[PDB]
């Protein structure tokens, strides 16, 4: 059953079309085959989108797969909601709940709100690009108003190429006026690779700055530039290279010839191509389940003008979309589920931070569950809160009256408490205030030399330091050491 | 449907309104078919040919009025259906005039 | 390698000990913030030059 479909592809989406050609024969042919008529045409001109859509409807196909631009989303929704033709896409998700659209890209916005709330920012800059749309820009302003944030949002996308070396210099020097430190980028990969190079030229990647990339292929762009900088760069991934089928596709993908499939003989892959691959899995699961339920899709006639007045559609496409919304397989993004509208739920997004060795994950974020860090505590050097022993003596070390409600190093008060804070301020270490157990100053035992008290805590390696009323004698210098004396007294 | 029907009718000059969702469809037909279109609707953003528009721009006057009232901190309630060009405009002057 | 590891901000200061100071690349650290001085024996302003 070679079933007629239609495909829309931009002039330059060569990696994506090659991944579609791979996924075409990656799994098929125990059954029905596909008849893809490919349209390597533009996406900006909605008249061209109209011509291609009426051409493929003149063909009379059952389903159309491809991309759309923000100047075409209204046209695609307006034709598909009329003519009941199910349309599937990997592009940016739509704003309104529209029928007959399945969209392969998950949400980013709740993830990005989770990331900002995890880092606990208050004031930042937001460089956005207009031509991807403004839904995230609308979403962050509401929570910025509620969560008392201070956003300086800046449009950057309409800047031409021929002034594109000094516009960024004027832009970041205006950011130097408020002395910005925290930048969220929201662009395509080309604008990211343009803006990272201009940052690394004007010298803004030292320790102190902090960058969040709002894309899905965090490692799909260049990261060898600002890897060794000093700035810290975080982003998101939906394609995790650790997994079994992922690494299988990596080995399958690397061994292909570049000449037959352009952009294929690399290690990594674009997330757009990954979703294009999973789209074939969904689309074949559809016609699989319709032969499971044995429902015939016989058109039984020709199609005609797309301008038919009034045009009348066929509701077996409604049943096609109904069976499309029930597809649940595993793919490169993980599990998939759909809503009542065609939007994706049941996804998982990995949080990816850049380190010196390279990228690494620190946690995941689900469709309902918030940010769960994976407890990756590779911090090998923790400055230990050192052991400070003392004893209760007025006014050297005294209890407070409200010690149960307070905690720890706040509970004690006196001369020695004030002194130890000065020592730790001058020396930069961490400390915890402890008490000697047996309640003594300490002397040695007869015939066994067992120093008890505050002496043996330092002799026997128990306590680390002792700021306390201790008297320099002759018999104490042999086992512990003393500084210069700080307060004189007598019997 | 209406535009294809009237160009099949052989219209010499097209006039009518548009919302935020059909603006690309009409400018994409008119740039190809070279038909003069006239409108009282909201003005566009990019310089498109064959579109005459009677509604004047606003953003310069509104920025001048904010500078005259001498403000620093305010709220801004918007609707999306007329477009978001003014919202994109006032944020840049917010970035400049702090 | 300096411009990769990020040591050309305002504060650092470099002296090139050569004769063709402009014969090498200077578009890299021109906009940095560091200050770079050197020597020339071939002056492009002159007539025969
Ligand atoms: N007047 S006092 O007892 O509180 C007192 C006693 C002393 C102080 C400082 C004070 Cl405020 N520092 C001295 C040190 C300073 C120098 C000279 C000896 C030691 C080094 N030791 S000390 O003689 O023990």
Curated annotation (Swiss-Prot), chain A:
Record field: catalytic activity: Ca(2+)(in) = Ca(2+)(out); Na(+)(in) = Na(+)(out)
Residues on Extracellular side: 1-491
Site (Interaction with the cone snail toxin Con-ikot-ikot) residue list: 444
GO molecular function, one term: cytoskeletal protein binding
Alphabetical GO biological process terms: cellular response to amine stimulus; cellular response to brain-derived neurotrophic factor stimulus; cellular response to glycine; cerebral cortex development; chemical synaptic transmission; conditioned place preference; establishment of protein localization; ionotropic glutamate receptor signaling pathway
Compartment(s): Cell membrane; Postsynaptic cell membrane; Postsynaptic density membrane
Tissue-specificity statement: Detected in forebrain. Detected in dendrites of neuronal cells. Expressed in the pyramidal cell layers of CA1 and CA3 and in the granule cell layer of the dentate gyrus.
Disulfide bonds: 54-306
Induction note: Down-regulated in the pyramidal cell layer of CA1 in the hippocampus by global ischemia.
Membrane topology, from the record: Multi-pass membrane protein
The record's note on its domains: The M4 transmembrane segment mediates tetramerization and is required for cell surface expression.
Subunit structure, interactors included: Homotetramer or heterotetramer of pore-forming glutamate receptor subunits. Tetramers may be formed by the dimerization of dimers. May interact with MPP4. Forms a ternary complex with GRIP1 and CSPG4. Interacts with ATAD1 in an ATP-dependent manner. ATAD1-catalyzed ATP hydrolysis disrupts binding to ATAD1 and to GRIP1 and leads to AMPAR complex disassembly. Interacts with GRIP2. Interacts with GRIP1. Interacts with NSF via its C-terminus. Interacts with CACNG2, PICK1 and GRIP2. Interacts with GRIA1 and SYNDIG1. Part of a complex containing GRIA2, NSF and NAPA and/or NAPB.
Family, similarity comment: Belongs to the glutamate-gated ion channel (TC 1.A.10.1) family. GRIA2 subfamily.
Function summary: Ionotropic glutamate receptor that functions as a ligand-gated cation channel, gated by L-glutamate and glutamatergic agonists such as alpha-amino-3-hydroxy-5-methyl-4-isoxazolepropionic acid (AMPA), quisqualic acid, and kainic acid. L-glutamate acts as an excitatory neurotransmitter at many synapses in the central nervous system and plays an important role in fast excitatory synaptic transmission.
The protein, known as: Glutamate receptor 2
Organism: Rattus norvegicus (Rat)
